[PDB]
A paper describes a structure:
In serine-based β-lactamases of Class A, C and D, this hydrolytic process is executed in the deacylation step involving an activated water molecule carrying out nucleophilic attack on the enzyme-substrate acyl adduct ES*. Here we report structural and computational studies of Class A β-lactamase PenP with Glu166Tyr mutation that analyze the interactions between this critical water molecule, termed WAT_Nu, and other components of the active site during a full cycle of hydrolysis. In summary, by analyzing the reaction intermediates observed in the active site of a Class A β-lactamase hydrolyzing a β-lactam substrate, our study has uncovered critical features within the active site that coordinate and activate the water molecule for hydrolysis.
We set out to capture structures for in crystallo deacylation reaction intermediate by transferring cephaloridine-soaked Glu166Tyr crystals into cephaloridine-free buffer for 1, 3 or 6 seconds and then flash-freezing for x-ray data collection. Notably, the deacylation_3s structure reveals two distinct conformations in the active site. In one of the two Glu166Tyr molecules in the asymmetric unit, both WAT_Nu and Glu166Tyr are shifted back toward ES*, occupying positions similar to those observed in the apo structure. In this “attack” conformation, the Bürgi–Dunitz (BD) angle of the approaching trajectory, i.e. defined as the WAT_Nu-C-O angle, is ~100°. Unexpectedly, for the other Glu166Tyr molecule in the asymmetric unit, an alternative conformation with the carbonyl of ES* tilted almost 90° upward and away from the amide group of Ala237 of the oxyanion hole. In contrast, the “tilted” conformation with strong hydrogen bond between WAT_Nu and the tilted carbonyl oxygen is not catalytically competent.
Author numbering: 31 to 57, 59 to 83, 86 to 238, 240 to 252, 254 to 293
Write the structure that this text describes.
Amino acid sequence: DDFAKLEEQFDAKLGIFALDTGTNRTVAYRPDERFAFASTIKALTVGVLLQQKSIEDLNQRITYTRDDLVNYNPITEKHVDTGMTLKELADASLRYSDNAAQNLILKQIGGPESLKKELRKIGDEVTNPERFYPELNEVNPGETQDTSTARALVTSLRAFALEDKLPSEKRELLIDWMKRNTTGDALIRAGVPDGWEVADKTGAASYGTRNDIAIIWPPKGDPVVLAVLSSRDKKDAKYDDKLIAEATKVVMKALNMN
Ligand SMILES: CC1=C(C(=O)O)N[C@@H]([C@@H](C=O)NC(=O)Cc2cccs2)SC1
């Protein structure tokens, strides 16, 4: 009941799945409960992009205009005049959660419907991409569009980053981007001792949805893959990062890593 206690303290619903890739030991709490995936989808999106292109092909330059910019464009809003390469867009999407970058990448891989088809091909029957930004943040309780589960996001992040859905050079690019994420310092990273390498992707959406998916490398040992998803009862609810940090501390204890 440490997970239950956190739902009580933060008045939120929590979805946890963690897999120690070294022992196949698992920590779960509502692991199959749907949540809006929010920006966590960006990680899986770069997965599919990497699978479909050579590394050299990421050097294709994408021209775009103000009309491709949406509600949060911290990198893309600076380079309308020059455009950005696919590699630069992958960096913006993963490290800054640039929503226009995600939309431009989605367009290059054939849109939300194409992304869905490529996720089913890697064995993910759960994650349901259907819309672009900004609409994908808008998910009402009980709806399944743009939702996933903690178990499915772990299984899929692991498949791309650590297994055989990508060749080693592409896994390395994806892991490196996620390792240098700038948006995650208050979430999973804040539940993990300084010095352990962490790769993560955050998200936030309606109903106070607040998510983080990560790979954690304990000093030595095989890594852990973790999803912490959360949501609240009201549409305009605020979230609290500290719920994710605290849930992460619980996982690390339950796995005897701290
Ligand atoms: C703060 C934030 C993140 C993140 O932390 O990863 N990613 C982008 C996106 C996906 O989560 N969120 C939105 O665009 C919708 C919003 C929810 C709360 C503020 S904006 S923009 C909002």
